[PDB]
Design a protein around this ligand. Structure first.
Ligand code: HEM
Ligand code: HEM
Ligand code: HEM
Ligand code: HEM
Ligand code: HEM
Ligand code: HEM
Ligand code: HEM
Lengths: 147, 140, 149, 145, 147, 140, 149, 140, 145, 147, 149, 145
């Protein structure tokens, strides 16, 4: 259950296919689906997003937030090969979430389940196992002091 | 003023120049080295991210965070609702720091210079300038 | 005339054109670019706005004119993608010619203007652009589409 | 078995992108689909006499086949933009109304698309997603349920 | 009669052989021969060159004029692969000749004929057809507003 | 003072550093970018040729005209009669513009620096400096 | 757990480790680095000084402790060089495990700290360091050596 | 303050960046071109070694001597008795020349810059800075 | 015939560096030495029963063999640091004292080392230098003259 | 007895093996052995090194002197392919030795013999002939005005 | 084989010399360089001016001296181009040897000076110059031509 | 058929450069010309007895042939410098006056040069320009019309 070098390389290939275009449509919609999944399984999490306007899901402030998450994840994937920079940034992402009261270890487990349910729907020949292994390793660090 | 063709040009050219994993890392470092070289005062606000050592993993992370930010804004040049919100968000992150607005202009001079090296004579200076200028104004 | 849109000429055009679809949101690019081209055409030759009444050029951002923008962009894409097969291309450009023939108001002058607008706009989006190759290839395509006018 | 929703529309767009290709690959791709259609419903061939359907290598038939995939391309590319898609599908429907095309044929054509794409991409394709999305596109061209 | 991509490439290889040495002798002599040809077929054109001293054809002012022409042509050839720069520069070269009252399209037709007669004498396996196609295209733009 | 061996050296080294089609275009751009970076006043006289955008085709044309000009003078280093005439000609073409004589000095400084990069440790700085200096003086 | 210190993982570790012996005065490097690590270990867990009384940690620079610094570095070098041979590696780590088992005071807590010190130290000497691959591989090794504790 | 790990990092990184035969000559030229470009006063003390022409064999010799000297001190970072003696010896060789102590700071600034180019994002800036700073101080 | 002095210690250090290798090469090297030892004194094998000496491919034996070369490595690497070398050789002596290892054996071992190294390095090795330095290392392990 | 291009290339290969680590130990010991050899064959030379403290052979000032010589030789080897730089520098080295009265052509012959005798003991497959040929050429110049 | 103007030596010399004739106005280069060399020779050893009276060194730029400069330069070109064929080189250098032998006044000292002038001037035209290879090759050639003096 | 004018001299200078080559190619080239000469006028061979004309592989003969092409190289290179050419041609004429060389021989030599050059460059040569310029050069060596 450790994120191997092979896993990390496997994820790099996968990632080229979800994160295509330099337009936002694809990366708004996937992350939107991931969150819909999150809110379906942990509905109390929906309240953490009022400041970015979930109440107006097509608002632009909400869509830009979706893109920020997308790019955040894209940053993480593109760091899977610079492990010391990764280690450092992971701490930064952790501090951003610690500073949002209500964000818990459970919700991060839930976003994990959301990605594993959704990603296989956007691309085929997806190696969900490698993905989960690395995603859990990333989430482990981000959520270390959250609950 | 960034019209349809220029935003499209910037997106396409950014896709090449940005690169991927470690290609990003080297780009970001080269940029900040150029900037801080030209203007040592800029290290002061980077106190928390080890601006004194740009080769450290802490600054490397900040550098990556920046390029990822540039990447969001470039991918949003064609969606004004989202661009407005995102630039607002970025401004918030810069506004309570003693940042002279001209720091961002130095940032642009150097971004264009380094992009110039990467893309060569094909570099659409006109487009980049118009386009990124807008992103800078929204943060500045 | 074997030196007009030659073998290498059309190969250059196809390579340079392909570059616009490196990424998956090609529709977005097609619509933006096509919309820009026709809008500019309507600006320079005002009568064109009437020609595109059926497709609601009045609301260039609307679904109607978007679909049209795609149809035209895919038309040009078709021609470019068939440059390496002259007889198939001719069949295709003939079909396009008939499609423009049955439209009242559409004239050769419009196709000359479009070609200019097109020669100006392509380099603004493609950072690799052989003006000479594109010019000869675009002329052949534009002339065949407007021969029936 | 699956509806052409957001996620399946997404997947089909990408996989279509990868399978569609350009130049000579695209010509081959177009012919492979029409041959697969003809193999399943040889009756349909008579519909294409004006466009030399008797010979799938004829330049006039290549043009027609590229033109078809041109239209299909617009439809797939706008799966995530329903208003634009509806506009395109109406345009196609108007071009097909009057022609005697029984469901039987749209059905063979869909099987052909899926068969050729599957070959084009090997494993990396979702058949149920393609099936739902080609269905949705064909419904708009037929005007029928 | 368009200047193809193959033609432009052909002209590059040709041009390596005429435009050798970083010495002026060869490029003084070829261009001198081109103009002798021009003057033989269009004698009234000779009157246009008094300011650069045709009257003293070994003068240095006239020889330098011949090199400027040689290098102007070298510039055009070396722009055959940078078509937008080429397009711009071509107008510049046009303006320089429009400001010379007396320069006509007919004379540019003549210099074309002169190159076609002279080049095949300085190098063998010279593709005069490819040369003519491209040289006409160049001259067409230079002499657009000349007559 | 450019003797016979030095002019020969410059001719030879120029042949390599100059290059051909696109290699010339990239050389010229790199040169002017360096110059205008170091002295932005120099854009002012380049007003008619888009000095504000050195990546434009208008300025690329001007750039190429300059290198082709340098080419003429380098190739005339051994013919004083022709060199005198050509330098006079180039001077006419520069004389009515508010060009400070030091502009040419800055030009030479950067020409030598860019040439150094292309040619490396083999670069005959002495020969170049002597040789081009005389050219610069004839136009200055 | 076939993804913990995987094939490529240990191959990365071996390649990166190897760079440290690019030169012939490896003993000098081994002594310096080994001494640094254990010195740091004792600093953090003072009871460790007693554990190394026999090897004269008191005079870290002395020939006694120098030899020991080499013995441990080669111990770690042995494990790294056997990563591509799991059963041989196990035999090797089992042997080390006994050697520490027979030392009173040495405990798992010590090996956990050492792992940390080692993770911090390695990138200070290797300019190419996969933190993830080293972490998983070092854990496997450190755990096997300390199980009999 | 150069600990054991840092001196070792510098040793290892020097081995790569330094190179061997002609690689060293190119390194030295790039370094001194950068320095002298930035601070042309530094040519004055180089009167005897043709500082006016860094591409000359005389300056190349001087340049090689310098890098070889740097090499000696880097290889001595772990032997204080030797480092002390060597730095004293080097100081004797600079003491009687009108060298502002800041010359060595400029040298360092450029050394780390060129080293950054050669080594990339892996450059242990912190280690180098610490380590060579000490060397600089001993000669300064 | 030659003494393990400065120069010969320097040479042996380099040549060891080159012969010793890593990973699979090191395992093979480790094995080649023991097999040559055993080929010369098959008697000695009985001492290694606790470490599967009967089978030189057994993992437990590989570990042992690598462990031996590990000790040899420390010794060779500190040929130029007498005080450290002494301390290492004493540690080894303590681990060999008690065992019944006749000079006969150390002698065969030395011949094996020299044999396998000469193979590894082809021409580029000095038999006399190695012989001297291995002798010197072995004296400290035996404790004998 | 000229230093050929092949010899120079041979010496480069040799040199990588003597000049390893970026630690001084190896390059201290080899040069010390070279000097021991010199002092054995020309004992009066030993008095030239009192300023660098031979009397204290482990002093650090003397060890650093040994390294300076080592690095001076390393300098020369690494110039064997930049012959004009080499020529210039060789004079510099000559001048440093001319300013030490007592250094003779004979002692430089002796250091050549010392290297020839010592290097073969530190590495096998050492081409002593190629080494002597080039060392003699280098020495010839260093000691031109010494005697 | 054999270390003086060795195989690689003469190959370095030939490659480096060849650079001079990259361009077609090689007469211009031969005349300029040869004139420079002999002029410098006469400057250093004034008696040399008398030796070259027959070729009008008095008018260095003249057609007489020019032809001669081509002649010597081609003589040196001949030797260099025969370096990969030692026996043909010897025949050529021996022929040159005779030609100088029949000129009274021409002496070994002149050829030693020429070698120095040649060594100084060559790097001034070639930005790639192995001083050692040229020195040994030039020496062999100059010695052979001047042996009969 | 054509005179050695400015343009023909220009062409011959370039084509000579390309055909002349260097090193082993130049030797082979030198020999090809003399063999072609001898094949055409075998009588002429006897003139070269002092320089081993009986064996064209002999080093003394190569040297001689390289020497001849060296003279020709000077002549061709200065076709554009009449004053210099004349001086070279006079030098050569002095070296040939005395020898009994019939026009017949200069004639075969010219044919041989053209023949070998034609082969060396394949299509890319102008026989009429070469013929004219070699004639011009030989007129100065003969001293005859
Ligand atoms: C490079 C050129 C062009 C291409 C490839 C092109 C292609 C097309 C295509 C594929 C259609 C839709 C045909 C259909 O499926 O019904 C179309 C429609 C049309 N085109 Fe073009 N076209 C081009 C240039 C122009 C220009 C210059 C005009 C200007 C008068 C023009 C006027 C029209 C009009 C008026 C329609 C009908 C719009 C409607 O009511 O649906 N086209 N064209
Ligand atoms: C899902 C798919 C389909 C798409 C996207 C599609 C699209 C098209 C397009 C773009 C044209 C050309 C319109 C024009 O420019 O004139 C076309 C023509 C036509 N289509 Fe389809 N089509 C589809 C399915 C079918 C099927 C299943 C049939 C019957 C087997 C069919 C029969 C025809 C015929 C007979 C023509 C006219 C050919 C001619 O010009 O003579 N189509 N279609
Ligand atoms: C990565 C890990 C380590 C390796 C490879 C390692 C290896 C070794 C080796 C090879 C020896 C000498 C065995 C012999 O007698 O021949 C040794 C001894 C010893 N080790 Fe470790 N060790 C490691 C970590 C530690 C740690 C974390 C401790 C702290 C409690 C430790 C405490 C000792 C002690 C106390 C001795 C005995 C010292 C003596 O000779 O008195 N080791 N170890
Ligand atoms: C030059 C040589 C030698 C070196 C450097 C050497 C070194 C070693 C080392 C490092 C160990 C493991 C210590 C431990 O962790 O338990 C070892 C164990 C041993 N050695 Fe040696 N040794 C040498 C020669 C020999 C010879 C010649 C023999 C007799 C044939 C021998 C017999 C043993 C035995 C029987 C063991 C114990 C195996 C076991 O654990 O069951 N050694 N030696
Ligand atoms: C292959 C040869 C040699 C090399 C590369 C060499 C190199 C050097 C170098 C780099 C220095 C330091 C100069 C400075 O920075 O002050 C030096 C100093 C010196 N060398 Fe040599 N050397 C060589 C042979 C000799 C020989 C043969 C002698 C005579 C025995 C000699 C006697 C000295 C002396 C007396 C000093 C000055 C010591 C002092 O007072 O600091 N060297 N040499
Ligand atoms: C590397 C060297 C040299 C080469 C290859 C060389 C070659 C030649 C050649 C090919 C000729 C003309 C032979 C003929 O066709 O009659 C010549 C003539 C001559 N050379 Fe040299 N030469 C060299 C150096 C010198 C030097 C150093 C001297 C000075 C003493 C010298 C003095 C002469 C003289 C006096 C003549 C006769 C000039 C005359 O025609 O009156 N040469 N040499
Ligand atoms: C276009 C033509 C020719 C050129 C450029 C030419 C040039 C030369 C040159 C440069 C030499 C050497 C002078 C010296 O250094 O001693 C030479 C020698 C000679 N040439 Fe010619 N030559 C030409 C044609 C001929 C022909 C056609 C013949 C008669 C078949 C001929 C017969 C000789 C003989 C007999 C020698 C002297 C051989 C000896 O040294 O024993 N040449 N020529």
């Amino acid at each position: 259950d450790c994120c191997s070098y092979e896993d990390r390389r496997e994820i790099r290939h996968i990632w080229d296919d979800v994160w295509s275009s330099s337009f936002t449509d694809r990366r708004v919609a996937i992350v939107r689906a991931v969150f819909d999944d999150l809110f379906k399984h942990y509905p109390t999490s929906k309240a953490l997003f009022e400041r970015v306007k979930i109440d107006e899901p097509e608002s632009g402030e909400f869509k830009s937030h979706l893109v920020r998450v997308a790019n955040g994840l894209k940053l993480l994937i593109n760091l899977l090969d610079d492990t010391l920079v990764l280690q450092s940034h992971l701490g930064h992402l952790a501090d951003q979430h610690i500073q949002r009261k209500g964000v818990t270890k459970e919700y991060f487990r839930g976003i994990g389940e959301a990605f594993a349910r959704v990603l296989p729907q956007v691309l085929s020949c997806f190696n969900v196992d490698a993905w989960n292994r690395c995603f859990h390793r990333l989430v482990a660090r981000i959520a270390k002091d959250l609950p | 003023e960034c019209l349809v063709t220029e935003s499209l040009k910037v997106k396409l050219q950014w896709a090449s120049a940005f690169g991927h994993a470690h290609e990003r890392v080297a780009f970001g470092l080269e940029l900040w080295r150029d900037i801080i070289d030209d203007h040592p005062e800029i290290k002061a606000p980077f106190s928390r991210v080890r601006g004194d050592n740009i080769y450290s993993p802490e600054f490397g992370a900040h550098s990556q965070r920046v390029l990822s930010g540039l990447d969001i804004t470039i991918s949003m040049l064609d969606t004004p609702d989202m661009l407005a919100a995102q630039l607002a968000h970025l401004k918030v992150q810069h506004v309570e720091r003693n940042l002279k607005p001209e720091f961002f202009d130095i940032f642009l001079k150097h971004l264009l210079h380094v992009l110039g090296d990467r893309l060569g004579t094909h570099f659409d200076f006109g487009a980049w300038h118009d386009c990124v200028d807008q992103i800078i104004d929204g943060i500045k | 005339h074997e030196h007009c849109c030659s073998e290498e000429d059309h190969r250059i055009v196809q390579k340079q054109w392909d570059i616009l679809w490196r990424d998956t949101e090609s529709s977005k690019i097609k619509i933006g670019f096509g919309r820009l081209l026709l809008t500019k055409l309507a600006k320079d030759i005002p009568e064109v706005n009437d020609l595109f009444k059926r497709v609601d050029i009045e609301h260039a951002e609307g679904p109607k004119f978007s679909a049209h923008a795609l149809r035209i962009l895919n038309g040009l894409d078709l021609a470019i993608n068939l440059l390496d097969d002259p007889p198939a291309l001719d069949a295709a450009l003939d079909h396009l010619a008939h499609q423009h023939e049955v439209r009242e108001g559409v004239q050769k002058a419009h196709f000359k203007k479009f070609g200019e607008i097109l020669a100006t706009g392509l380099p603004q989006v493609l950072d690799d652009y052989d003006a000479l190759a594109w010019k000869s290839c675009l002329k052949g395509i534009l002339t065949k589409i407007s021969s029936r006018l | 078995k699956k509806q052409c929703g957001v996620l399946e529309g997404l997947k089909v767009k990408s996989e279509w992108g990868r399978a569609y290709g350009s130049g000579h690959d695209r010509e081959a791709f177009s012919q492979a689909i029409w041959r697969a259609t003809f193999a399943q419903v040889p009756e349909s061939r008579s519909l294409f006499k004006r466009v030399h359907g008797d010979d799938t290598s004829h330049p006039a038939f290549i043009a027609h086949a590229d033109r078809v995939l041109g239209g299909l391309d617009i439809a797939i590319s706008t799966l995530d933009q329903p208003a634009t898609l509806k506009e395109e599908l109406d345009h196609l429907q108007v071009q097909h109304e009057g022609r005697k095309i029984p469901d039987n044929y749209f059905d063979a054509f869909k099987t052909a698309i899926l068969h050729v794409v599957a070959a084009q991409l090997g494993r990396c394709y979702d058949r149920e997603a393609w099936d739902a999305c080609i269905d949705h596109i064909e419904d708009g061209i037929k005007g029928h349920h």
